[PDB]
Amino acid sequence: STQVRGYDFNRGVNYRALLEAFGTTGFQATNFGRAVQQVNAMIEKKLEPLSQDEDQHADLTQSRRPLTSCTIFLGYTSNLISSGIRETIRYLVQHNMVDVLVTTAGGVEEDLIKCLAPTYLGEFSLRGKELRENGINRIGNLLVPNENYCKFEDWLMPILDQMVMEQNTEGVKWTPSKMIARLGKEINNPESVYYWAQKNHIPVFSPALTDGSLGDMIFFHSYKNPGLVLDIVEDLRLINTQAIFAKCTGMIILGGGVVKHHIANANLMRNGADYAVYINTAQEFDGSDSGARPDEAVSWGKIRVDAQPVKVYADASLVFPLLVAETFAQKMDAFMH
Amino acid sequence: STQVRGYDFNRGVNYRALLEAFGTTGFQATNFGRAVQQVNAMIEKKLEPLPLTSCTIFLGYTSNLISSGIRETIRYLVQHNMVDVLVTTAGGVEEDLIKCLAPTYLGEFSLRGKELRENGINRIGNLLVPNENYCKFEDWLMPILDQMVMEQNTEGVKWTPSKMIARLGKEINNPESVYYWAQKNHIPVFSPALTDGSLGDMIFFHSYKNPGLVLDIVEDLRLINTQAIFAKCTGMIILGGGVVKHHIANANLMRNGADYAVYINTAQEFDGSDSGARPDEAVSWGKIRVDAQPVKVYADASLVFPLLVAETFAQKMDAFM
Amino acid sequence: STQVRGYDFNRGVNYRALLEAFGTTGFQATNFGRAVQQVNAMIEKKLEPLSQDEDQHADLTQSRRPLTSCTIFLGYTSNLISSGIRETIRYLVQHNMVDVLVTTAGGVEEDLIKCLAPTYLGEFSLRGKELRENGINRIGNLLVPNENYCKFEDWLMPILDQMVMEQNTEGVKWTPSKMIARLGKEINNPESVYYWAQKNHIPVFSPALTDGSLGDMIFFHSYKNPGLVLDIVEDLRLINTQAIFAKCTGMIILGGGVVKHHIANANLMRNGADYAVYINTAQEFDGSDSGARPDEAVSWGKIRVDAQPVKVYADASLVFPLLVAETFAQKMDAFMH
Amino acid sequence: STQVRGYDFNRGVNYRALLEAFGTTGFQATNFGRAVQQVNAMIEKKLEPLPLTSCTIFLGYTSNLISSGIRETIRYLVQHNMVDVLVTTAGGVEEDLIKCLAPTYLGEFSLRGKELRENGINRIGNLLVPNENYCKFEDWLMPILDQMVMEQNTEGVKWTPSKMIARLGKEINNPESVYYWAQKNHIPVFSPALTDGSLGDMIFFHSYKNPGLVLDIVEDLRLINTQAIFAKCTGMIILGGGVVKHHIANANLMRNGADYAVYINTAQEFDGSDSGARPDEAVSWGKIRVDAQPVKVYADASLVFPLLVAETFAQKMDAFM
Ligand SMILES: NC(=O)c1ccc[n+]([C@@H]2O[C@H](COP(=O)([O-])OP(=O)(O)OC[C@H]3O[C@@H](n4cnc5c(N)ncnc54)[C@H](O)[C@@H]3O)[C@@H](O)[C@H]2O)c1
Ligand SMILES: NC(=O)c1ccc[n+]([C@@H]2O[C@H](COP(=O)([O-])OP(=O)(O)OC[C@H]3O[C@@H](n4cnc5c(N)ncnc54)[C@H](O)[C@@H]3O)[C@@H](O)[C@H]2O)c1
Ligand SMILES: NC(=O)c1ccc[n+]([C@@H]2O[C@H](COP(=O)([O-])OP(=O)(O)OC[C@H]3O[C@@H](n4cnc5c(N)ncnc54)[C@H](O)[C@@H]3O)[C@@H](O)[C@H]2O)c1
Ligand SMILES: NC(=O)c1ccc[n+]([C@@H]2O[C@H](COP(=O)([O-])OP(=O)(O)OC[C@H]3O[C@@H](n4cnc5c(N)ncnc54)[C@H](O)[C@@H]3O)[C@@H](O)[C@H]2O)c1
Ligand SMILES: NCCCCCCCNC(N)N
Ligand SMILES: NCCCCCCCNC(N)N
Ligand SMILES: NCCCCCCCNC(N)N
Ligand SMILES: NCCCCCCCNC(N)N
Helix, strand or coil: CCECCCCCHHHCCCHHHHHHHHHHCCHHHHHHHHHHHHHHHHHHHHCCCCCHHHHHHHCCCCCCCCCCCCEEEEEECCHHHHCCHHHHHHHHHHCCCCCEEEECHHHHHHHHHCCCCCCEECCCCCCHHHHHHCCEEEECCEEEEHHHHHHHHHHHHHHHHHHHHHHHCCCCCCCHHHHHHHHHHHHCCCCCHHHHHHHCCCCEECCCCCCCHHHHHHHHHHHHCCCCCCEHHHHHHHHHHHHHCCCCEEEEEECCCHHHHHHHHHHHCCCCECEEEEEECCCCCCCCCCCCCHHHHHHHCCECCCCCCEEEECCHHHHHHHHHHHCHHHHCCCCCC | CCECCCCCHHHCCCHHHHHHHHHHCCHHHHHHHHHHHHHHHHHHHHCCCCCCCCCEEEEEECCHHHHCCHHHHHHHHHHCCCCCEEEECHHHHHHHHHCCCCCCEECCCCCCHHHHHHCCEEEECCEEEEHHHHHHHHHHHHHHHHHHHHHHHHCCCCCCHHHHHHHHHHHHCCCCCHHHHHHHCCCCEECCCCCCCHHHHHHHHHHHHCCCCCCECHHHHHHHHHHHHCCCCEEEEEECCCHHHHHHHHHHHCCCCECEEEEEECCCCCCCCCCCCCHHHHHHHCCECCCCCCEEEECCHHHHHHHHHHCCHHHHCCCCC | CCECCCCCHHHCCCHHHHHHHHHHCCHHHHHHHHHHHHHHHHHHHHCCCCCHHHHHHHCCCCCCCCCCCCEEEEEECCHHHHCCHHHHHHHHHHCCCCCEEEECHHHHHHHHHCCCCCCEECCCCCCHHHHHHCCEEEECCEEEEHHHHHHHHHHHHHHHHHHHHHHHCCCCCCCHHHHHHHHHHHHCCCCCHHHHHHHCCCCEECCCCCCCHHHHHHHHHHHHCCCCCCEHHHHHHHHHHHHHCCCCEEEEEECCCHHHHHHHHHHHCCCCECEEEEEECCCCCCCCCCCCCHHHHHHHCCECCCCCCEEEECCHHHHHHHHHHHCHHHHCCCCCC | CCECCCCCHHHCCCHHHHHHHHHHCCHHHHHHHHHHHHHHHHHHHHCCCCCCCCCEEEEEECCHHHHCCHHHHHHHHHHCCCCCEEEECHHHHHHHHHCCCCCCEECCCCCCHHHHHHCCEEEECCEEEEHHHHHHHHHHHHHHHHHHHHHHHHCCCCCCHHHHHHHHHHHHCCCCCHHHHHHHCCCCEECCCCCCCHHHHHHHHHHHHCCCCCCECHHHHHHHHHHHHCCCCEEEEEECCCHHHHHHHHHHHCCCCECEEEEEECCCCCCCCCCCCCHHHHHHHCCECCCCCCEEEECCHHHHHHHHHHCCHHHHCCCCC
């Protein structure tokens, strides 16, 4: 039984101790402290060596990812890529601290586009009429110039020409994850999440990849050079076997929607994830999947009954960088060792 | 300039009158009244003369709304061809079908997932779904999938979500099914990530006993975008957020914005989510015409929607017949 | 075990059946159906005759309110008076369907002011700069002209002169509830909630009555005619004995904040309310009192352990008129009988 | 024009640097960065030369924040005279005192109130408070109340909330108490409805063994309004909504608006609540000067506040000493 005590600034600004203090501060501050421990538990377990029996089992996948004592699924809604959390995510992927990525259309395309042009800060109140008249798109309190997508078009189109050909002439069978790997190879920029992703053999799943600017481009291009096909069935198999053949699994889910359900549902195939941390703003009263508490996932069997999941009700733009600072970033060496 | 005034229950209770008073009650009560006007404006426009209509209506809803009784409310609109395009996520598709094989029950939000699981019960909000529901679903679905694979290989069928949804509705062949009616009235259903739910599970398993099935999401994009592009007028009625919302609005962007738009979701904007984005943000992208007067009602659709329908579509059932 | 089934509009628009359908529709629709039953349970119990033993006990209060088999507490946040819910509340009070009212400063003053000038509809997006330049105040998507308060000033001031005198010369010991009764007598308008309230001997409590335009007026007036005193201690006793000496008690709480806690806390004095229905938009993650679920109140003893409380997560402007339509308004006769 | 860019953990971990990156991370991360600037602008202004200051800071918080560890964070600011006026509800006052007699524990939100009650434990969010805590509180409080009544009758003391709060802090006489420090540094505390919580319970009971106590809320209004009226500059830092928020802002309206304003609450506007109102609505009433650049962070203060303080007030501890 721990007592509620907040950080005493009479000790001065000791950032490390200040963050540790959140766990005994209460409300969401405490959930954060719990989130930190749960994520570390995943990390600790992942860094465990793979005994013969577990290594054998984990090795039952075609993937080239070095089996780990714990497979970590990282999911985030598109807008989090629009935000600076893109850098926070790029880092983890860069150093192989996570094994599978799941994000919606926006979450993929905007990572690339940021390699051709930046997103600007703005305000939530800016009116859509004047904005449009100036060729500016609004994403929360962020701003994206139309030119950003034009550039995106110039860069993408030829790649799509390559993919359609490779499809018909070399018989490739495209899927979201495969295309995402390809695009990241193509972007060839170290500031790109997906560039790293493919380099480190970390699969990215996005069932509705057509729901975005990337979908726009594919749509248009499909007229001058028809044929492209994106099968979502193969990718389901792919992402499900990732959960099925894992020694342990951790889910780190930022936001809700498809990203959240797709990751957890994959973990149901192995009868529950071992660790789970949620950081979303959704509430449960609307009966949405997004807002469901981690305990609801327990009923379905997406989170083992003996697991100790945590949900932090907050905007990830604020919490995540912090979570990372106290977990993965602290084991920087181990992930390079 | 309208004054604030709520319904005076001294008149006794006239439900039609009470619903009308919302408009001047304020806060979300007002937005509801505004929503009613917009939905009617769509309707009026759709009913204009000179099978395409004077206004193409896109109806979108999150899966959970199909888990709820709103399944009936949506089934009705589809049943009488009051809407043109349906957009819903995987759960929203499969659960309509499952409800024709077994019911979903009421429950509580507080029920613990441990005991629930031990009793073979899944929780969807304050609703409950027995594992046996999905077993039945599998029994029903498996053989249809076999044919689909067959037809794909021997008959050259290039499956996509909408196509599969049409097939399954035809297959469920039950008047209580939204998708049964959808295919009958040639109302297309779009679900990019159809593989995100039990239907995906089934497709997954089945792919090992009979491999091969392919669901293309490219064709469907063209399909849904052309739906918006060649339309005289368009109205968007979006319950919930996520893919359902963005997908429908992004399609209208191809026509340079929708003519009418009504949203009913619980999302807020501060998180910078697309779900919580106000209709005015969509205007900046060009998904909602600058001259349009969109409306968002911050509320649970399980409450608002049946009411919205009662004061709009249900009031014109004769015109739709 | 009831099955989930929504209203089938193929039966046509039968409003009465449509609303009954909410209970089996799920999510908040169901909570509404439950709210309707809980409120009716209060009503049914209130309309029960008072046996000798219960009548004796209930009669142990100085109040002139005809003891009922169930004392109903109605609470609402100020903004709900600004809205049309003012009419919905005025109705219940008008016909004695509730026994105690609890509302914040705004909730009192705006009821009177609406008797001198109306509140207009507006938009949430209207900028505060241009609004102020035109002497318009914003309350949500509602609008209130400065003139509204000027009028309020002219009407009020002399009454305050009367109260200060009556305080010093006739020894009155003013408190919020007493002043609220007085103001309602003074407003003398049947469209006024508080006019009816005092007429029907229904006490209104508002501990922080000074938190509003009424507080502004009192502040100013206190300079030309100093002395006025508002004791909140007497009112505490008053509102607590209302709960203590009740045969049964029902809480109907719209919104949160003081209104919610003050009513429930009073019910703790009798070791729990018998029925309770909440309609607020608050969530619990912030550890606020507003957002606490009714079950938390059970831990303190504000809601009997055997009660079956209900909370509807929604804007009261939408739900309340409906709740009323299916409960109190249905027993219109009984309350006049 | 600033580009969006989040912290690059490749630099390793520099907490001060990481907090700085929030400003350009976006969504609420940005608002936090904006809040930091505003709080500092207040500070800078307050520290200007030529006991009144070049800027009067009003600090407001909902009771529950005193239940949480934020009690320490607030105690600190009050301890070093970094703020001028405190405004908090009844719970926010009594629980600070109770924490000097017994601690509040961590718990869970899901714990059922039935079992909890059977074990003499009260729930405050995911926190827990034992009934014995309040028994101790009663023991401590009763005799002080006796004196207060006495002094009121024999010495003509006209009690009000602020006055009682000063007295009780003096009385708790413990350095860990916010209110102990408040009275020592002559920092007034306002709580119009002080009778809304255990302190009210105690006052209630005690009034039967020793009747008479009167708490006037009129004097306190004048007191708090004059605080804003005669101020060179004013800054509002409001954690939460309800009375705390409105009361502080309404007081600044008497001076025709506050110079700086930073809000940290979880409330949204759609309900038309005063709590959820954006800072721009306060501008229409004249509570926030038209030229001011207010900031609201949509978040739980238990997370944001300690951080905000670390980057503002804590950075100037030398200036405040
Ligand atoms: N970035 C964009 O805004 C954008 C851009 C292009 C396309 N899209 C398309 O929009 C579709 C829907 O977007 P989505 O499903 O990825 O997300 P979303 O915006 O629909 O959000 C889903 C839920 O995640 C939670 N959430 C969102 N932002 C959060 C935050 N900052 N912190 C915590 N929780 C948060 C909320 O509870 C929200 O209801 C995508 O599938 C994509 O195709 C997104
Ligand atoms: N019904 C289910 O829970 C279920 C079942 C099977 C599969 N799925 C899968 O879960 C994925 C994510 O679900 P989703 O994107 O359809 O929705 P969601 O549950 O993620 O909700 C998205 C947003 O819509 C709003 N919303 C949801 N319910 C609402 C309501 N009743 N009233 C008002 N607004 C509401 C909320 O702001 C929410 O954040 C789906 O793509 C699907 O494949 C859902
Ligand atoms: N009407 C006004 O806006 C106004 C006017 C003058 C003075 N005031 C002053 O402001 C102070 C604070 O106001 P308050 O405590 O009465 O309320 P509030 O605005 O602080 O709301 C408190 C909580 O009630 C809930 N709520 C509010 N509106 C709701 C709705 N429509 N439906 C459901 N739940 C709702 C929300 O969860 C909110 O957080 C009052 O004490 C009063 O003195 C109010
Ligand atoms: N701590 C307690 O729970 C408690 C204890 C005893 C008495 N009380 C009584 O309850 C009454 C109502 O409480 P209140 O008006 O102080 O607050 P509240 O709990 O009613 O909250 C009002 C609003 O402030 C915001 N908020 C609350 N907690 C927040 C957080 N951690 N971060 C961000 N924003 C937050 C929310 O939007 C909320 O709707 C008080 O007047 C008091 O007399 C409180
Ligand atoms: N194959 C398992 C799918 C489980 C779906 C669970 C859906 C839960 N939905 C809400 N909580 N809204
Ligand atoms: N093809 C255009 C897609 C535009 C996507 C815009 C997304 C906005 N997202 C927010 N979170 N506001
Ligand atoms: N005299 C009993 C007072 C009980 C106060 C309970 C406060 C609960 N607070 C939150 N849930 N935030
Ligand atoms: N003395 C001026 C008081 C102004 C009160 C305004 C309240 C606004 N309330 C909202 N819910 N917006």
